[PDB]
Amino acid sequence: MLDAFSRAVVQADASTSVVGDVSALKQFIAQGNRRLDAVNAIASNASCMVSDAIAGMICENQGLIQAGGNCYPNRRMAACLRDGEIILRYVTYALLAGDASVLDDRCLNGLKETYAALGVPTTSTVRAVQIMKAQAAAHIKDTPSEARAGAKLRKMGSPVVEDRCSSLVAEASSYFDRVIAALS
Amino acid sequence: MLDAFSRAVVQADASTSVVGDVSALKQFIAQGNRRLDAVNAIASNASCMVSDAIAGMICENQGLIQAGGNCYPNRRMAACLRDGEIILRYVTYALLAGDASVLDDRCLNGLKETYAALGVPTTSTVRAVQIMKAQAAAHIKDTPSEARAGAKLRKMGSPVVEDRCSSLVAEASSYFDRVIAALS
Amino acid sequence: MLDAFSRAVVQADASTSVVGDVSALKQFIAQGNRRLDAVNAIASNASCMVSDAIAGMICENQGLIQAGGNCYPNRRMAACLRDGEIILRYVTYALLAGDASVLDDRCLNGLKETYAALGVPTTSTVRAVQIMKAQAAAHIKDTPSEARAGAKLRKMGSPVVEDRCSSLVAEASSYFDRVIAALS
Amino acid sequence: MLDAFSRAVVQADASTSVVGDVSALKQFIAQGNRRLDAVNAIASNASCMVSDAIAGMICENQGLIQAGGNCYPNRRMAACLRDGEIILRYVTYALLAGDASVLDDRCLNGLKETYAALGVPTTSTVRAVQIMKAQAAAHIKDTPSEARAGAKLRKMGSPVVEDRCSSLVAEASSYFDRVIAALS
Amino acid sequence: MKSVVTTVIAAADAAGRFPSSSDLESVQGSIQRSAARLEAAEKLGANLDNVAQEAYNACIQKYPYLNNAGEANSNDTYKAKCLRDVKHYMRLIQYCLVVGGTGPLDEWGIAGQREVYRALSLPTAPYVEALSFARNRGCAPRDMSAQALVEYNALLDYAINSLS
Amino acid sequence: MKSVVTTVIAAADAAGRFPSSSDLESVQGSIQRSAARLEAAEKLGANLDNVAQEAYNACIQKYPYLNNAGEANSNDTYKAKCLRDVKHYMRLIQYCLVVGGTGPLDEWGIAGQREVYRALSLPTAPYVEALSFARNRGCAPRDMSAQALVEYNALLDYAINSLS
Amino acid sequence: MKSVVTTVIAAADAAGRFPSSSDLESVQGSIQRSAARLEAAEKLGANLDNVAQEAYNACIQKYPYLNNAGEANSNDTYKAKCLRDVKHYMRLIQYCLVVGGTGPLDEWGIAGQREVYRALSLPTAPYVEALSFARNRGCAPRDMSAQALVEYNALLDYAINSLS
Amino acid sequence: MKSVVTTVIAAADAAGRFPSSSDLESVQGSIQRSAARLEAAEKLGANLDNVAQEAYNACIQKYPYLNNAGEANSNDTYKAKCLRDVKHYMRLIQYCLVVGGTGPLDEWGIAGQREVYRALSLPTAPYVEALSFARNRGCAPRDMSAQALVEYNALLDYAINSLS
């Protein structure tokens, strides 16, 4: 797998050139502590995210939990919770690395054809991934609502900036959009 | 795998018949010593053949050793030198056996599709094998040129015949052409 | 595994010196054709030898084919026949090679302890090996009795000498003796 | 495996108590950069340490490279070079960890019995380790001699203190002494 | 025992590698982060009884049915074992803060927890509530520095994640 | 297909080796022995029908019960298939003499023979007697040279050993 | 491609884990060390031709026999490829300083080097002497900061170690 | 130890077979070729010291840099070990001529040779030049019979190939 730095290196190698301009890479380093905060915010809330996101997909689509539904019976529901967890885990790896390589290579490559072969619905998987994307943006900004979270609300208490790490929120959202793109 | 004799057996079995003309197999046996000298001449010169054949292919196409070239970087050059040794090893087996069966079954079968998947260039592979064909011809004739060998020139000292084993030259040449045919 | 020749090399390597006298090895080559006849004589008669040896061990020890006997029931008889064939096979490899190395290393090493752990009886195993020793001696000399063979008598038609290859008989016999010594 | 901090945890756990005094652990952290210098100094010089240690062992005992000696022939000298590298590697792991656990569990456990079965001699293995101990000491202190290194001399250019990391020299030396104790 | 240094050593050893640049650079991270988590370890080590007592109280506060005859907090032995369990978790967290990885929680708390609580009919929700209270209770700088609290909270959330 | 050269090639390939000294030396063995075994191949190829017919006749003479209604030699289809089987073994022996290994007997004769004869209730003993008669029958120099006969007898004994 | 973050991701993924405390701590290491190795990367990037040139010159000065007809530096094609090879290694080192691990050198330098130089009969010692010269040449703070030079030298020694 | 007879025994044993026609035929090769290789072994054995001495002298003559301070032929210990090594290769070649296979050279010369020469900074070209000289030097019948010289030369080429 590649990270932010090894991506730059692979690009320099394609013209057997030295890495010329490490200015973007120093800005990546100046952003390092907020990146570790962003990852901490997802990993620390991962069980609540996966459970609320699958529960969300289901509260919208009651078909999935009846006869012939793909979260019926118990075994299928467990399998689906496991995929929500796996997809969030690989998105979190990409955010820590600052590159989509690990998500592409280890999670998304062949995933649509696997889902088509098992008869796992695309459209429902994408809805679960969209809720996790919103959850992640909220937890990175540290503005989760008491309305969504109730007794399970968590605050991270990271040093506040007025944009609330909008750049890390867009990058994370981009990784989730890559899963949604690969699955539809 | 088969050898010259079991090939005649397979052909005879195709019509549930005895092997008919054993007189003509006695002549293959009479050529036997010169067959072992031809094998000895390729095996004994195999490092000098492979390195000269791969350096030849490269000296005609500098693209192989530049960014994007399939002999760049070190890993890819090393894989290619390995392939040249593998191909020549299976050709020498086919020469010792007087049949292409072992070459076909253990080397050529699937080689085209393997190279297409890896993006190994067919053109440059063919040129490597062409130079190996020419080298083998000269080593079986025991007429390598000082021009191509310099200080690595080797003479084998076999009993000289007028044709210089023209039949084994043609046989060995058909095995290299068999490798090249297997890449299309 | 060693043969008669690598045995001399291992002896010479213990003093990091050249093999000095090859005269003993030249006598081994002059004996070569009779050695191939001796191996041919055992291999060609091996089924007859193993069944006749195991049936002899049994005809002299009827307890083996009664309740609690180690050739009872069918599974154990089969295993015994297999063991006779294995031991004769490794003796025949030693005779082909002209060294006990393959017999010691691949057959005898740990065999006595294996038998102890299984409760395979020593005296009966040794008896079966003594009968095979006598059979092999008779097939090597090409003097099997009709009394012992009835309708299964085989003659080899090797060029006859006065000693009837007494040196190969003694060598073959010493290999059978190593089995009896390893098991008793 | 354990490190210096999980070693203190395992001790506190033996009386189900909190880790009470962090100050010793605070001093480990403050020593941390010189520890990475010490690991750098060994790892950067490892090939030169292994070849000079095995050469020095042989320097002191010509037996190892004569008929019947345990560094003869080439396969055995290679095996010995390989063991030297393995032992130094696990010692370098213990020094990075600040605990002998990985060295005990992955290298030393069964090693005496392994060397016993193989006939690898204890005196000479202990002598190679004693030279590696002295080389590691000089590299951690950054006082290697030109007299022992020639053209291969390496200076690390670390910030010099009076004691030249005498505590790390002692610790790394005690890991080499655990190898010696395990072989005794 | 998973830590910065045991992770890089396990990775080097699987590849037959001496420690290299990326390995040393990982351990420099331990040097940087140590001051945060060792502060959290000292504050937690010094006040473990009172921290665990109020977290145990909070979990019983949410689940008063545990006090009714027959439930898991309903006698003096049960009470003492419940508080002990909360103290065990907070002790392993103190160990994680000392080590800078989850090793002590993974090996000594999490491994076998669901088999144990299943077999003894101990519900998981009160364990979760005790840790959840502890996660939500701390503030900086009253209880420890900001980054000490980040380290403390992350390990509480890791234990909660393990039971959720 | 097991012969001298396929055995050394298979051994060379399993080790990633070019042909070496022992491989060439092995094949010199084929050059030397070929005269004896190709003489036997020529004689057997030229006289296969007569050789097999008389081996078939020996097994029926030994086992006349095969002629009784319901037994394996009892009708004209059964007699033709039995003579044909004897000829198949002898033709495979001719192939082994051509090749100088047991490959053809192994692959096309022995493999499956036990399962076929079990399934068809074809007794083994008549096959063994046909090949036994063929083994005992030849003499040098009447039929072929002494070493041609050794080669012929050795493959007949190999065939017998596969059914014994 | 081995760096701090890919080593911890690969270890996390093998055990099916989310990033945890030891994984973020490792990456803090990369944040700390980035300044030193990114300094070395810029110095090396800006002056690669000059740094490589004096290293190549040093290796030909130590081994003039290379200039003899038939030897590895004995015609201008060979000469230009030799300097090119020294610059290749220095470029892969610049890549390692950017990434903060050995991946670029491991994957594009060291893999297959032994097999390539053996087949083309390229002596090892002149590569070792070029890198050795570059390793002994630097001093701080003249050429870069002390810790920039530790990072530069570590990768030069890593490369020397691969050829020794 | 790879020979004609150990190659066919290992093949028979992996298949659970008695020696058969292709095995005996293989060993007749040894009976046929033994006269040439035993002759080569007697000639090389009788004159090992002078054969190795001129091969050693030729490789130092090609590479006089080895004589300079700090190079591999620069002291009398190194000088004596270099000639010893050439002698070792020639001795193992004698063993290969006695055995009629490459076993002795494979096990005692070739296995580990690359790790040993790398670790001690011994360049391989002078080993190749010693063997290459020995390969070009012999002629028949002056030194041994023509077929003896084919066997001697094949084993030198095998050794050259192992280092090339």
Ligand SMILES: *C(=C)C1=C(C)[C@@H](Cc2[nH]c(/C=C3N=C(/C=C4\NC(=O)[C@H](C)[C@H]4[C@@H](*)C)C(C)=C\3CCC(=O)O)c(CCC(=O)O)c2C)NC1=O
């Ligand atoms: C053979 C005749 C013989 C030897 C071979 C040699 C073995 C030996 N070496 C030491 C001590 C060291 N060797 C070192 C190695 C190196 N230094 C470097 O700069 C490079 C990177 C590397 C490889 C050459 C080092 C660092 C030492 C430590 C001492 C020093 O630097 O001077 C010893 C032990 C000496 C002691 O106990 O102090 C031995 C035996 N000795 C031979 O006689």
Ligand SMILES: *[C@@H](C)[C@H]1/C(=C/C2=NC(=C\c3[nH]c(C[C@H]4NC(=O)C(C=C)=C4C)c(C)c3CCC(=O)O)/C(CCC(=O)O)=C2C)NC(=O)[C@@H]1C
């Ligand atoms: C666990 C409680 C986390 C947490 C999770 C968050 N949920 C967020 C958004 C969100 N959740 C759902 C599912 C929910 N809605 C339903 O109608 C039902 C079923 C009846 C369920 C299970 C949805 C649909 C959404 C979408 C909102 C959107 O698109 O933006 C969320 C982000 C929004 C917010 O915080 O308000 C979070 C963070 N939050 C926590 O604090 C704990 C740890």
Ligand SMILES: *[C@@H](C)[C@H]1/C(=C/C2=NC(=C\c3[nH]c(C[C@H]4NC(=O)C(C=C)=C4C)c(C)c3CCC(=O)O)/C(CCC(=O)O)=C2C)NC(=O)[C@@H]1C
């Ligand atoms: C969006 C992600 C957030 C946000 C993040 C910020 N955090 C800032 C600084 C900061 N964070 C940490 C913790 C981090 N570093 C580590 O080494 C580890 C774990 C091993 C973690 C979890 C540290 C140490 C720091 C720096 C300390 C300090 O200087 O106080 C930060 C301020 C700096 C910046 O501008 O990038 C921000 C913005 N802040 C937000 O607004 C949302 C919620």
Ligand SMILES: *[C@@H](C)[C@H]1/C(=C/C2=NC(=C\c3[nH]c(C[C@H]4NC(=O)C(C=C)=C4C)c(C)c3CCC(=O)O)/C(CCC(=O)O)=C2C)NC(=O)[C@@H]1C
């Ligand atoms: C084309 C290949 C050659 C050529 C070859 C000839 N070699 C001839 C005879 C011959 N070769 C050997 C060595 C060989 N037999 C073995 O047993 C082994 C190894 C185990 C090897 C390497 C021998 C023993 C012999 C026979 C003895 C002799 O003739 O002195 C030969 C003559 C026989 C034939 O025509 O088949 C030829 C032609 N000759 C050429 O002109 C080119 C260079």
Ligand SMILES: *[C@@H](C)[C@H]1/C(=C/C2=NC(=C\c3[nH]c(C[C@H]4NC(=O)C(C=C)=C4C)c(C)c3CCC(=O)O)/C(CCC(=O)O)=C2C)NC(=O)[C@@H]1C
């Ligand atoms: C198979 C028929 C071979 C063959 C076998 C030979 N048997 C030889 C000796 C031998 N056989 C037995 C066992 C036998 N004697 C019994 O009393 C009973 C059962 C009541 C049996 C089954 C014994 C005891 C011996 C004597 C061994 C000894 O001296 O210790 C033998 C060698 C001696 C000889 O030939 O007279 C052979 C060769 N002979 C053949 O021709 C076919 C192919």
Ligand SMILES: *[C@@H](C)[C@H]1/C(=C/C2=NC(=C\c3[nH]c(C[C@H]4NC(=O)C(C=C)=C4C)c(C)c3CCC(=O)O)/C(CCC(=O)O)=C2C)NC(=O)[C@@H]1C
């Ligand atoms: C004791 C074992 C025997 C006996 C053996 C003799 N055989 C003699 C010569 C001989 N044998 C073979 C066949 C052998 N060589 C092969 O290449 C193969 C198979 C590939 C086999 C099975 C041959 C070719 C020859 C040489 C030709 C000949 O001389 O007829 C032989 C005579 C030579 C000598 O004295 O060593 C003997 C003595 N003779 C006996 O008395 C017992 C029964």
Ligand SMILES: *[C@H](C)[C@H]1/C(=C/C2=NC(=C\c3[nH]c(C[C@H]4NC(=O)C(C=C)=C4C)c(C)c3CCC(=O)O)/C(CCC(=O)O)=C2C)NC(=O)[C@@H]1C
């Ligand atoms: C949940 C949001 C879905 C849903 C999911 C299901 N997944 C099922 C099986 C399954 N999923 C994968 C892909 C997964 N495994 C991986 O290794 C990775 C990446 C590393 C991922 C993302 C696989 C390979 C499999 C098959 C193997 C297995 O069972 O573990 C599944 C079970 C189907 C069945 O067996 O009947 C389900 C139900 N289903 C839903 O309704 C929502 C939309």
Ligand SMILES: *[C@H](C)[C@H]1/C(=C/C2=NC(=C\c3[nH]c(C[C@H]4NC(=O)C(C=C)=C4C)c(C)c3CCC(=O)O)/C(CCC(=O)O)=C2C)NC(=O)[C@@H]1C
């Ligand atoms: C050299 C003349 C070529 C060239 C060669 C490359 N081959 C690469 C890898 C490769 N080759 C094979 C086929 C090979 N292996 C076998 O087992 C057999 C037959 C028994 C043969 C002939 C395979 C399966 C592979 C993949 C596995 C491996 O890495 O060894 C290769 C590397 C591709 C890559 O990974 O990037 C190259 C470069 N390339 C050239 O430019 C010339 C024309």
Ligand SMILES: *[C@H](C)[C@H]1/C(=C/C2=NC(=C\c3[nH]c(C[C@H]4NC(=O)C(C=C)=C4C)c(C)c3CCC(=O)O)/C(CCC(=O)O)=C2C)NC(=O)[C@@H]1C
């Ligand atoms: C016959 C002369 C004996 C006798 C023999 C039995 N052997 C039994 C099993 C057995 N034998 C071996 C050794 C065998 N296998 C090898 O791999 C080798 C050498 C390479 C040899 C010689 C083993 C390992 C085993 C166990 C595995 C298996 O069943 O194949 C056996 C069965 C014992 C039992 O299970 O009860 C018997 C009966 N028995 C006799 O009475 C005579 C003296």
Ligand SMILES: *[C@H](C)[C@H]1/C(=C/C2=NC(=C\c3[nH]c(C[C@H]4NC(=O)C(C=C)=C4C)c(C)c3CCC(=O)O)/C(CCC(=O)O)=C2C)NC(=O)[C@@H]1C
């Ligand atoms: C040696 C002098 C014997 C002996 C031999 C006799 N065989 C006779 C007839 C015969 N043999 C065969 C089989 C034979 N011919 C082949 O083509 C092959 C193998 C390829 C072999 C081994 C046949 C087919 C025949 C019938 C036709 C013919 O005669 O060739 C024979 C004539 C009388 C008879 O049929 O028995 C003799 C004398 N007989 C002896 O008593 C000594 C020991």
Ligand SMILES: *[C@H](C)[C@H]1/C(=C/C2=NC(=C\c3[nH]c(C[C@H]4NC(=O)C(C=C)=C4C)c(C)c3CCC(=O)O)/C(CCC(=O)O)=C2C)NC(=O)[C@@H]1C
């Ligand atoms: C420390 C005072 C040393 C010392 C240093 C000197 N080096 C000199 C010149 C020099 N160094 C390099 C390599 C250097 N430049 C880079 O770009 C990098 C890495 C990216 C390195 C490590 C070069 C190319 C040159 C020539 C041009 C230049 O940079 O000046 C130097 C000037 C005189 C000379 O070349 O010797 C000095 C004094 N020399 C010492 O005596 C101590 C130990």
Ligand SMILES: C=CC1=C(C)[C@@H](Cc2[nH]c(/C=C3N=C(/C=C4\NC(=O)[C@H](C)[C@H]4CC)C(C)=C\3CCC(=O)O)c(CCC(=O)O)c2C)NC1=O
């Ligand atoms: C600039 C790059 C460049 C190269 C690397 C060579 C590569 C090369 N070698 C040969 C051709 C050959 N090369 C060898 C090789 C050898 N002869 C011996 O005596 C040794 C044992 C062994 C290693 C040197 C042989 C035997 C031939 C056959 C032709 C001949 O010998 O003249 C040919 C001719 C191919 C043909 O006819 O199609 C070519 C192009 N040529 C180039 O222009």
Ligand SMILES: C=CC1=C(C)[C@@H](Cc2[nH]c(/C=C3N=C(/C=C4\NC(=O)[C@H](C)[C@H]4CC)C(C)=C\3CCC(=O)O)c(CCC(=O)O)c2C)NC1=O
């Ligand atoms: C995890 C830890 C670990 C190790 C430390 C090694 C331990 C080890 N070493 C050897 C292997 C060996 N070890 C040596 C080494 C020596 N001979 C000498 O004369 C010197 C005194 C000494 C070097 C200092 C030798 C010579 C052999 C081969 C012995 C033989 O095969 O005859 C072997 C047998 C397998 C092989 O051939 O490689 C093993 C298991 N391996 C491991 O997995």
Ligand SMILES: C=CC1=C(C)[C@@H](Cc2[nH]c(/C=C3N=C(/C=C4\NC(=O)[C@H](C)[C@H]4CC)C(C)=C\3CCC(=O)O)c(CCC(=O)O)c2C)NC1=O
């Ligand atoms: C990733 C790689 C990495 C490293 C390799 C280290 C490198 C490193 N070492 C030190 C710092 C140091 N380095 C040493 C070490 C030594 N001094 C001696 O006299 C001995 C020769 C040697 C024995 C070990 C010392 C003594 C210091 C000064 C600080 C101290 O006293 O501990 C410093 C702090 C800055 C300074 O004080 O200059 C750093 C960053 N850190 C890293 O993160």
